[PDB]
Design a protein around this ligand. Structure first.
Ligand code: HEM
Length: 154
């Protein structure tokens, strides 16, 4: 789907994420909750975290962020060959957590924002476009899996 050069840009910036998965995951979740506060309602154990500093101090939140970014990294490394990795994620996020596709758009925005904030010299326009395409492919394929399970994801 993406060109080889596009995948290389995606995986180059992902290697920078991997130097500090925990910190990237914290910043991505905090940015998501600040930009789109409705998303915080999906995390029952985070509702007592009232400030950014409380969110950064929560080992629970940090672990959730690492788990999410670890799954996303494993998907990105498949360079589109990710049906086997997406099926359980779709099942879980559609049927258990009830995450609309729009919320996956929101977290994608947060991912792009944090990656550019931390790695501008390794995440210029071409790399941003490549990452946007990779996350778009992720969302398109997961939306198809949602439907297969009986969830439109709207
Ligand atoms: C790049 C997009 C995402 C990835 C790769 C991802 C990945 C994961 C993984 C691997 C887990 C643990 C296994 C599971 O329960 O499925 C998880 C848990 C969870 N996810 Fe996501 N997720 C993403 C986006 C979201 C978004 C946008 C939301 C809500 C707005 C969300 C809500 C949740 C919740 C509520 C849990 C349970 C956490 C817990 O109680 O430990 N996810 N996610």
């Amino acid at each position: 789907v993406l060109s080889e050069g596009e995948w290389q840009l995606v995986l180059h910036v992902w290697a920078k994420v991997e130097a500090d998965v925990a910190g990237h995951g914290q910043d991505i979740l905090i940015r998501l909750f600040k930009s789109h506060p409705e998303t915080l309602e999906k995390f029952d154990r985070f509702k007592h975290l009232k400030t950014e500093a409380e969110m950064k101090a929560s080992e629970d939140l940090k672990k959730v962020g690492v788990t999410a970014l670890t799954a996303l990294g494993a998907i990105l490394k498949k360079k589109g060959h990710h049906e086997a990795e997406l099926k359980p994620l779709a099942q879980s996020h559609a049927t258990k957590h009830k995450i609309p596709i729009k919320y996956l758009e929101f977290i994608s925005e947060a991912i792009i924002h944090v990656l550019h904030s931390r790695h501008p010299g390794d995440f210029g326009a071409d790399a941003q476009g490549a990452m946007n395409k990779a996350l778009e492919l992720f969302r398109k394929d997961i939306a198809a899996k949602y439907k297969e399970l009986g969830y439109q994801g709207g």
